[PDB]
Amino acid sequence: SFDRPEIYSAPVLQGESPNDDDNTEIIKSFKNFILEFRLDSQFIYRDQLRNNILVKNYSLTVNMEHLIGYNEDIYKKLSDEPSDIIPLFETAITQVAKRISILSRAQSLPTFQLILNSNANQIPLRDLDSEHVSKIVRLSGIIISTSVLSSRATYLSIMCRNCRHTTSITINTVSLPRSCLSTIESESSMANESNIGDESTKKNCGPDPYIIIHESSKFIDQQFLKLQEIPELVPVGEMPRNLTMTCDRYLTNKVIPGTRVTIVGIYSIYNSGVAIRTPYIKILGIQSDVETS
Amino acid sequence: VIIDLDDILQYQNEKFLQGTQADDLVSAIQQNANHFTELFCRAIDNNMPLPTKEIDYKDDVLDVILNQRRLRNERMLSDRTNEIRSENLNDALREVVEDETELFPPNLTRRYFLYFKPLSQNCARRYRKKAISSKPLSVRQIKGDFLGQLITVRGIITRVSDVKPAVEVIAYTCDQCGYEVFQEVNSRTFTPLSECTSEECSQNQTKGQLFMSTRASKFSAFQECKIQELSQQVPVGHIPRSLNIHVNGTLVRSLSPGDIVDVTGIFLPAPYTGFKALKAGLLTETYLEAQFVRQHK
Amino acid sequence: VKKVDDVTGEKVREAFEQFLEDFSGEVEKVYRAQIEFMKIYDLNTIYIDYQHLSMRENGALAMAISEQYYRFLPFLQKGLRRVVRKYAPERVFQISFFNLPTVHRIRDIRSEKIGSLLSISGTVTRTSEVRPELYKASFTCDMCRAIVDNVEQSFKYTEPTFCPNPSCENRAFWTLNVTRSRFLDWQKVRIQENANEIPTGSMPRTLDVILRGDSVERAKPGDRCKFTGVEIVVPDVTQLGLPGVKPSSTLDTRGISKTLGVRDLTYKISFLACHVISIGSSDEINELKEMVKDEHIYDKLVRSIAPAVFGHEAVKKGILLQMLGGVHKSTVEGIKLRGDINICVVGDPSTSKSQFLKYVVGFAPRSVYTSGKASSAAGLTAAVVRDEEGGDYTIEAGALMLADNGICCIDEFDKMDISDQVAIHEAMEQQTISIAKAGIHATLNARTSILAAANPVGGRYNRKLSLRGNLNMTAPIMSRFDLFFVILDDCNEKIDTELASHIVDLHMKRDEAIEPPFSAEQLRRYIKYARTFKP
Amino acid sequence: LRIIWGTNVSIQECTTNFRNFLMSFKYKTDEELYYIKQLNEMRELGTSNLNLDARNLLAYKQTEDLYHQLLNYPQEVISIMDQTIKDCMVSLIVDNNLDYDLDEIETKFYKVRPYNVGSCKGMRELNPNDIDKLINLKGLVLRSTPVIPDMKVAFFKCNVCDHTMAVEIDRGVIQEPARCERIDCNEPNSMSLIHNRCSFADKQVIKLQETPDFVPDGQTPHSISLCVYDELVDSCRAGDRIEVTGTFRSIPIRANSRQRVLKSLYKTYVDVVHVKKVSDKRLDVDTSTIEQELMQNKVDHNEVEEVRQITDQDLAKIREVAAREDLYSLLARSIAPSIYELEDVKKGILLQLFGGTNKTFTKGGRYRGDINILLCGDPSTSKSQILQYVHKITPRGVYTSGKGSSAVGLTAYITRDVDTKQLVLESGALVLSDGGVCCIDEFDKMSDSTRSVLHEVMEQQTISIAKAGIITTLNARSSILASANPIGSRYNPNLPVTENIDLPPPLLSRFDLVYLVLDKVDEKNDRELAKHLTNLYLEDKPEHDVLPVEFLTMYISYAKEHIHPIITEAAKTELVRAYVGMRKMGDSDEKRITATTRQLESMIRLAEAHAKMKLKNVVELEDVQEAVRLIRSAIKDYATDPKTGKIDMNLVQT
Ligand SMILES: Nc1ncnc2c1ncn2[C@@H]1O[C@H](COP(=O)(O)OP(=O)(O)O)[C@@H](O)[C@H]1O
Ligand SMILES: [Mg+2]
Ligand SMILES: [Zn+2]
Ligand SMILES: [Zn+2]
Ligand SMILES: [Zn+2]
Ligand SMILES: [Zn+2]
């Protein structure tokens, strides 16, 4: 009736020389930028991070000009492959925020959200094309439709309806396991006994055996938007084009239809010709021009 | 380290006779002996005095490795606290330092073994108690109600096995990151690790291949002995039965075939190993873990 | 995509082609004539002498081939193909090297020489049947019905590694066509280390030998053969459990985009041979005619047997006439008449009866020596080894199986048990040995002459009793021994003086004081000739 | 300064100290530089291995710590020592400007072999904390596996472009490339392993019967596994007594050939670094039995020596000791000083140790000089101490009893290996003793079945096998030294010899000498023996004109190696005359051991042994006369009646 063995580690030696294009160095560089960069002899980002933590807003708004000024290699990396670089910068934010919060408590945070603002030259909605897929773009237009708030999971606690084996999942297309995980997971020596019983019959929990225990899970907010080109410049004899936009968490309920905005995001695709995909934008930042007070 | 329960009972009675309250530690250790080993280990690791003799070229290698590990622990702690202080973002500082830093766990820095020995009949008889742990029993009388307790058996040793190393924790090394990985083993068999699981290699995209290092690993000296009933204990018209004893640590080589002894140990279960077709439920096998030996001659 | 090439390999190929073309008081060239001979007689193999190859180019070619035969064999094959196409009009060709400068023992093989060409010697213990061996397989692709032919195996079952056409992107999915593929003959042979090569206090070694093509069915159990070929390695699953660290192989996972096939490398040394020769007319017909034309030839024939033993002329005249036998006759009704002669020498441990056995075993062509108590029923007769790793069973010869149509020597004959005595009785009555073990029946040939040496039952031969009262044998076996030579000791001054003088001469003079009329080779030639007359 | 993690070794300190010890150390010939000359001789001859007596380090002050470092961390220290030896070598060759041809030494390899690690407590007394330390063992070789190829470099080929790679093993693991390293070809997982193109090393496993000095209560013998690598393979044969130095290891084992699951309980073994095959308490191996093995040692460049070295002073002392006129009595008296008198018994033992001359006929034929002796007499004499002493002095041999043996147990058998799970052939008592002496006690209790196998051993020095799977003839070049007790209680002198010994009369004639150890009561001899025995308890430790055992063994080994007597006509005449005399004398039957040709052979062997002693190369009249006298005295025909075969207790001298 033994329990489950553990695994741990500790650093002793110095491995190979670090490379520049490795995740840990990226995180360290971003942490240095957050804690050091100066504007007008001020620690803008450290101060605003401290204030936000004091306010319970778990996010940072960062201007791309400052980053390109501080360091160009990571700027190019972030521009080229945001899907790989954004989580690294978010985990750097969370690492700094942990220390800030502990020291403040001296005198259970989630993963922080990165909000990107920009002022570079925009691109027309009619100029987006294949070359921009998965890159970062800046777009202008008018909001014409906002949807209702949806619910998505960020942490799930699940259980098996046959053998009552429990586990967890963290999100930060994830799906519930197709099979029970109590076999591959050799938890214990008596766990091997428990996985067989009543003569010769094998143990098979079935397909999709897991259920979600809702009272012990966490969820976030989600929303959809529609952006249209400004009706002044549309060509004659044609209707205006638009695009679908998705934002989450702290970028929800920020604008209302009829507002003229600047959007920074990622040009992506999804599956809904022969090999056609439907484009859309992952929102990174919203900038409003001040409408209808 | 040998822990005598007579000392515990004397301490309890000393506390009682002068008025103050105290808990029954003896019975708790007796009924659930397997959990108090680590409690005593943790308590002892909190009070060990510093060494008054320097480490020289005539010490064991294990001591050298232990001392190196402790020095490395201290160096990492000092580096972390200095780095945090230099940032400009004292109980809280040490707390945050403890939260973000790895170390070598206490089990990898111990050098001693801990055993219990039972309550003698004399002490219980003088203090008006019933020393269960030192009432001799035959293999016949030990049933499933005694599992998880500290019990004593009287018998004659029939077989003893040669001492061999039983691995407790395996060690690996990663040339990519320089970390040391430790894998606990408490089963008759285990699966070696393949790829590194440290924080640095975990966060990166190219992980390193672990290599096994025997010298850093944790081993135990293991023996298994069989004990058989005495003639005067066997009922009329029956054949004597046997029992299994496990010996670990510095207690090895203390039993030789042909000895009539009184072994002390914790009675614990083990997985079933018979024929599959005759398994009805969660059946188990029993063994004794040795803690103390006494001879009749 | 151009394939990488080894300039050295092509250089050796050209060197070998020139060697074949340019090798030569009437001068002649042997290799071209031999290629012409192969064309004439439709053969498959070429025989090349090693010294011919060695005495050229300062030995560079000979060395390169010697320590890198495995590397350069395909290039030698290509060169031979080109030469034969140029000088002569599917066929599998084999080369055969032989006459190497030196020979190795089975006890002195090292992993350094793996993949090189050497020569070894040993005694054959077992041989298997000839079986077809997959050589160049043909497969049919599954995702598409393409066909792939001429796929090489290289000591193991190999599959094609990629579809040959871009119309299909198949890989690792194939089917084997057993109808349009070729095979070669395959045999396995087990050899044993020589008796005089076993070091002090140690048991003999064994080594597996593999034969192919036209070299199969050459070795015979119980013979000594000199082999030549390559030293190779094959998997050994049995090595797990040995101490030490055993190499393992895993796939390198650096440089692969992300978002287990480990193998064990244990091996054992075997031997794949290409030339096998056994080791034991001409002008000598004149010598044979001269020697037969002697008139007292019989006296010399008798005197040249056991020259190191004093006296005992009758035993010599029996040992002779045991080497030369009668004739086997068959009756119309099916009754077969024996032609073999059996002998038994009776004496106490203080006599010299064993020396006759030792002389016979050291001299006779196919002879085996064994002891009464150091033998067994399976040691005699034969056994069945059903653990043939590749297929059906095989049978291993015993003592009586060896020396068929020869002589079997049995010392301490009076210590045989009942079962082995019945086995010898069966061999004597009918010249066959019947095996019934592991559900397998078989019949064998045991046409053998038995030379036995027995001790008296009581230690000393009581001359008051008869022959039957002084022996321990059973009536059936005792009734088939056609000669009983009982040797006793007589005290006489001149006999003792002569014996002492002879013994002291042998110790002082050694080989010098022998002077027999005829040499052992001469006796062997005479007996071989004379066993073919049928009086 | 910069230590290695886990250890306390500093590379710089260790190399500096080793260099200083190498360049300044003397044996205190004791005043000269000991290791400078050894390195010089190594380079003159070209040897590559240096044998380091670890006890030499405790003498110098600096290396008092390097000793413990070597005993605790052999892995790092041995590599450091090898590199330091090569560096010191280049320094020695260049600092004096001897010869500008130093490329070979700069390209070859060096190595150091510790061989005097401290005294241990036995393999079974070690604990888990002793893994990866330096230890030593004593034992007897039983079996050895054939050479195992062990891969070091793997050879891959690409199945689209013929590009071939080479990968070196790394702590027992091969990293197979996952992509061709070409730019033209980049196909993934296209590389195949060609085994026959790989490079392999040498490996072997030896089974050892350990013989610890201290034995706890109730401990039975066991066996150990030894791993030898590279040049040390095939350097041991079953029956050899050896001393080994190596590392104490451990390893996990796979549960089955299908899965990759390991077992928590580990398997222990030893990795060998040095083997000692010589001693000062026993004779050297007979070189006539290892002819090809020495040649193979020379071919294999293994620096293990089978025979002990001789200094010039030792040879001079040998000559002087052989030049005196009391040599025979002195040598006899040296044997077993703790045994009183028995002059002729000790002379026979010494002659057996020396042995006769081996003839080898060209074109086939073998005569051997092994000498067989049977000891019969009163039960309470000292005839088993003799067997014990001869067993402990001889290089090879097994001490067996007649009733506790069997025909199979003496010759050969088949057993299933517990590691490889296959069947293997092992050796018996009489083959393990080849080249030595086999001691058999209580020869009269051996069964006739068991005795049957001794005939071939004593009549041709060989054995034949006809068993399932094995048919071969083995060498059994071993001498027989037996003992027997009389029928009843005491040797009755009123009966013939054949009525007192429970053996067939014909068997007693195959021995070379037969001794009748009779016990007679005479007050003078009783006083002498009692005083001799009671002097041994005067002080708690022994203190008993006797040569030391080391010098005796050295002398006998030198004589056996370097002298080969040959018989002359003057000896031939006496031999024939004496043989005819024995045959005629005594000519109503089974009253005496009848003379045979074996007696003439025995005289030849004994005369050759007498000549071989005292460093003579010719056998002469005195040798034959002494041989005949010894043969007659052993059976004491002087006190025997030729007619009735009885013995007179008054004509026998103690
Ligand atoms: N000549 C002698 N020299 C020394 N000790 C002797 C002598 N004769 C007898 N002894 C003593 O008597 C005992 C003889 O017994 P042992 O030799 O074992 O019997 P055996 O060898 O005849 O079977 C020994 O213990 C020994 O100490
Ligand atoms: Mg005795
Ligand atoms: Zn389940
Ligand atoms: Zn790592
Ligand atoms: Zn295809
Ligand atoms: Zn390639």
Author numbering:
A (entry chain D): 2 to 108, 131 to 195, 204 to 303, 320 to 340
B (entry chain 7): 78 to 166, 178 to 385
C (entry chain 6): 100 to 123, 130 to 194, 260 to 429, 443 to 463, 509 to 763
D (entry chain 4): 177 to 204, 220 to 735, 740 to 782, 786 to 852
What text does the study give?
Loading of the eukaryotic replicative helicase onto replication origins involves two MCM hexamers forming a double hexamer (DH) around duplex DNA. During S phase, helicase activation requires MCM phosphorylation by Dbf4-dependent kinase (DDK), comprising Cdc7 and Dbf4. Origin activation depends upon DDK, which phosphorylates loaded DHs, rendering them competent for the recruitment of a set of firing factors.
We imaged ATP-hydrolysis-dependent DH loading on MH-capped ARS1-origin DNA, followed by the addition of the DDK kinase. Three-dimensional (3D) classification indicated that all DHs were DNA engaged, as expected for MCMs loaded onto a duplex segment capped by covalent roadblocks. After a total of two particle-polishing and eight contrast transfer function (CTF) refinement iterations in RELION39, we refined a twofold symmetric, 3.1-Å-resolution structure of DH-DNA, or 3.0-Å resolution after density modification in Phenix40. At this resolution, individual amino acidic side chains can be visualized contacting specific phosphate groups in the double helix, which allowed us to generate a comprehensive protein-DNA interaction map for the loaded helicase. We also obtained an unprecedented view of MCM ATPase centers, allowing us to correct tentative nucleotide occupancy assignments, which were based on lower-resolution data. We were, however, surprised to observe an ATP molecule harbored within the Mcm6-2 interface, given that helicase loading is impaired by an Mcm6 arginine finger mutation that is understood to block ATP hydrolysis. Our finding suggests that ADP might be released and a new ATP molecule bound to the Mcm6-2 active site—for example, after loading of a first MCM ring and before DH formation. Another possibility is that ATP binding might be affected by an amino acid change in the Mcm6 arginine finger.
